[model samples]
Target: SMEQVAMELRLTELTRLLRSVLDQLQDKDPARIFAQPVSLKEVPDYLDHIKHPMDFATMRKRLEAQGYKNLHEFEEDFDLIIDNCMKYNARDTVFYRAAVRLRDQGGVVLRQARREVDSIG
Candidate 1:
């Protein structure tokens, strides 16, 4: 129950961010940028992958070896991923929003995580 409540709060915050992004996108021509429908649930997996410890070069190399251009290319379809996650995760708002913030601004958090890991190492 607590997790549910927490998720709800997070979802509320994430929705706010989504709205902000939407508003920003709306100011520009929609035809120029494809508007993909996104769900709140896929945030966790996206956060996890982005937060993976490997450097971007290494990740890119791995993906390229697998015949993938880059993670960004895969992430371009993230809206659909989010939609599925939301449906499966039951729309847990807290976790969803946390994941969104982590995905959207994870560089800063990754920097902090790296610093902490280095300190411990």
Candidate 2:
């Protein structure tokens, strides 16, 4: 029962952390730029610049599917979202700047979440 309790605690905390991180990212993105997949029509060369395209919609669906087994899994998606933007757009572009800010702010929450979860032992 004690082991099960810890498992339950981890699962619950991880779920909460994932939701919080996603919310923070979404809030920071008021323009909804990363809300969905990038349209090839809008940026014809998008695929040529970025190979791995990640977005909030994909992350949301994965979360709902209970796909993330740990913080790393969730964090991978988060990083991918930021990295894709930075890699595809020029540094002066809005997407690149937004990704920079998002990474800076979201990283704090992510680091703290990792610390909190590890301490649950």
Candidate 3:
């Protein structure tokens, strides 16, 4: 998987942060709504993350929006930012980190969920 290669690139810090958020989020809410960690495996026809492209206001709003209201909204928005990064770059810049963070995010979520189920069954 492309994520395996992203791991090869060594995004240790960003990966760790993402892992922290995902695990913490799930542990904080065992059966919350999460975008069940997926893959960028298939080049799977993508449309960009923006209808109105990023500018100063757009960027500011988005940055502000990261910690913005509705925990679910903030969390779900990570989905777009990561994909936005991927649709453009191969692997570099924040996007690369974003990509790796996403992969890490998915992994931690799955691991935590499995752990929860294991505890029950």
Candidate 4:
């Protein structure tokens, strides 16, 4: 139990940083494309298009479950969200364009998160 308190504190700090990044991405989604998972029923062919789907909602749920070991794990999933969009959508399409913007904005957000992490003792 000696290290439990320190570990708990670390978890709390990581969770806050990850959640803030998720929130930033959700806001920057131009078309609301990454707000939730691609609906199989609505898009039907989306599953066939995107082999590995990642969305803000899923990331949010995973963070609540403390699924990520560190910021890198969370950032990878965030990049996946953008990659999946670009993969499945055409270059000129709104979804693809939204993904492009998110990719840029997400990069800055992740950097800010890392800065905060670096500041901790």
Q: How do the residues 1-121 of candidate 4 rate in per-residue lDDT, one tens digit apiece?
A: 9699889888887887778778887888856878888889888988778888989889999999988888889888998998998988899998889889988877787787888877873
Instruction: Show where candidate 1 strays beyond 4 Å.
Output: 30-121
Better of 2 and 3 by TM-score: 2
**lDDT computed for candidate 2:** 0.84
Better of 3 and 4 by TM-score: 4
Q: What is the lDDT of candidate 3?
A: 0.44
**1-121: candidate 1 lDDT, tens digit per residue:** 9998876655554444333333443333223222232222744454543322222233234333443332234234333333334443444565355434434553444345345434633
- For each of the candidates, give the backbone clash count: 5, 0, 0, 0
lDDT-wise, the better of 1 and 4 is 4
Which wins on lDDT, candidate 2 or candidate 3?
A: 2
lDDT of 1: 0.39
Q: Rank the candidates by TM-score, best first.
A: 4, 2, 3, 1
Question: Model 4 scores what on Cα lDDT?
Answer: 0.85
CA displacement after TM-score superposition, residue 87 of candidate 4 (Å):
0.6
For candidate 1, the clash count comes to 5
Q: For residues 41-80, what per-residue lDDT tens digits would candidate 3 score against the true structure?
A: 5434333433322212232354343333323443455555
- In terms of TM-score, the best-performing candidate is 4
Deviation from truth (RMSD, Å), model 3: 17.2
Model 3 is weakest, by summed lDDT over 10 consecutive residues, at 51-60
